[PDB]
Amino acid sequence: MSEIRKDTLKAILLELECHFTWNLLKEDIDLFEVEDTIGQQLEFLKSRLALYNLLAYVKHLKGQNKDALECLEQAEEIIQQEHSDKEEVRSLVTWGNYAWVYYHMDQLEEAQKYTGKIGNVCKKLSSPSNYKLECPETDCEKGWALLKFGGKYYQKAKAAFEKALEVEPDNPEFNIGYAITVYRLDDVKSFSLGPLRKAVTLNPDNSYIKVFLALKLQDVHAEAEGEKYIEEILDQISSQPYVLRYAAKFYRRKNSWNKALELLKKALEVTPTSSFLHHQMGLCYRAQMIQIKKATHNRPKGKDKLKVDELISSAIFHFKAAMERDSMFAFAYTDLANMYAEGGQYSNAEDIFRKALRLENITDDHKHQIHYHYGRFQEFHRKSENTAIHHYLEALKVKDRSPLRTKLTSALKKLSTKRLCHNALDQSLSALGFVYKLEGEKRQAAEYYEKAQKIDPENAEFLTALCELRL
Known part of the structure; x- marks a missing residue:
């Protein structure tokens, strides 16, 4: 159980774009409340992807890494469901989360499997970065996660949503996220x-x-x-x-x-x-x-x-x-x-x-x-x-x-x-x-x-x- 290999992997993990690298601090929330809220949002609705990724991070925060993996399994299934040509690219956050969870379970070859998939995709698409890929969808996922982490994160969420809106001003989902964020910020104002x-x-x-x-x-x-x-x-x-x-x-x-x-x-x-x-x-x-x-x-x-x-x-x-x-x-x-x-x-x-x-x-x-x-x-x-x-x-x-x-x-x-x-x-x-x-x-x-x-x-x-x- 090498600290050398663990830290070597970790250096890659810190390069990823996913919940583990977005500075979402457990100290800033009531974990059980956030978990309850996400569960409710998932009820009886597909658009479930961001929620499953996030919920996985929250499960990890609660010390339930197996439940985390269950959530990522569901996220992956949903991606499969879309059946789009954008599967690989749509998978980066889920994969990053998988990599971090397996890392936290002291399971390094698995984690490395996922970092590998990520790096491979970034390579194919000639990203300016080795383990990240600039993506409005990712900005959107990030916006949702920040928003869920509460008042200390609203400005950050707004920025994330704005970034996405930069690329697609009339995207329905991006606009929902932005509008909700501004609503939370209004809390009074209009x-x-x-x-x-x-x-x-x-x-x-x-x-x-x-x-x-x-x-x-x-x-x-x-x-x-x-x-x-x-x-x-x-x-x-x-x-x-x-x-x-x-x-x-x-x-x-x-x-x-x-x-x-x-x-x-x-x-x-x-x-x-x-x-x-x-x-x-x-x-x-x-x-x-x-x-x-x-x-x-x-x-x-x-x-x-x-x-x-x-x-x-x-x-x-x-x-x-x-x-x-x-x-x-x-x-x-x-x-x-x-x-x-x-x-x-x-x-x-x-x-x-x-x-x-x-x-x-x-x-x-x-x-x-x-x-x-x-x-x-x-x-x-x-x-x-x-x-x-x-x-x-x-x-x-x-x-x-x-x-x-x-x-x-x-x-x-x-x-x-x-x-x-x-x-x-x-x-x-x-x-x-x-x-x-x-x-x-x-x-x-x-x-x-x-x-x-x-x-x-x-x-x-x-x-x-x-x-x-x-x-």
Whole structure:
């Protein structure tokens, strides 16, 4: 089992264009969620190729290399299915993935078989490169993979899709990928509306793209036109949980609770293991409940009272279900905890938040939001200013640049100031030092951090902060 040969092979592997070389980092996603999403997208539809390649990479990430190979087998079969003259060239990503998986299974001759096929094809076609072949289809596959890896990848996805569109501006698939990417980037904004209309025009039969157009129309207060698209696709998506859950989102945002629930129930029947779906159901119940409490001025009577009680229990049931199906699905923890807190059940909220705070292997984005919500809980329900500060600070440390940034910095100032009502600053000095360092006030930051070091001369955090401010 030679490290020499392993690294020699690896040098070739790094030359390939495929999921293993596209810097798709497991740290940036919830693997189980991404796996669930891809499985749903594959349901009851051919266009399955990119999804199978990607799913194989995801299986590898989960430590299921055999399942990975199963996915590549399916990808290969689909390529065969197209029966096109472009088989060899259409096979490069799948082959690259095969090479990497076999490499990770300590099976080097097999891996080399695939690198061989790849190099051979690149040779035949006189590629400027030995193991890659410039290809719009590949740019498209890459775009899809990046998109699936989430917000840290959207710009990259957009670039990939643009690159493909460079070659074929009116390719139906490339336009779907581009339009979806711009939609995700809109998440509010409406830059995606034109691209979405064009994508629908190029894909008249496609429910997936229509549902997103409908959502963007809803966003810009064109609810009737949107709803027309939803009705156009309803009969066709009955076994497609991925499309169903977005159509259900459309209804939820229109306050059509029962319709939303109807589609989500259909979706769950196709994929009952899905945390995402259970969580969507929870959001629906919760939203209706909030609506009734609002209309009833927080004093629902009679049947309204019965309904709110039922809705609270259903929401709780589904948030719990989501958590049971994926302990990493952080949103279900925060939504559940927040429901408890709103009902005055502080001990229950605390239990759930505590669980969430102890989850190490979740994404920084989720951690950022968990700290934010626990901070708010501390501030408005526990009335613990000190603890709120701690957690707003942790949220900022995890993610300096997010939508919550201003709220966090502001709140930190406020609370630190409340501290000075009766006591010199203690936690609070660190908070102000951090915030002014962040906002660019080096002098102030320095002062605060100096006081902090005074109090805790051993604190490596303050030491590092002061090392940096020293510059």
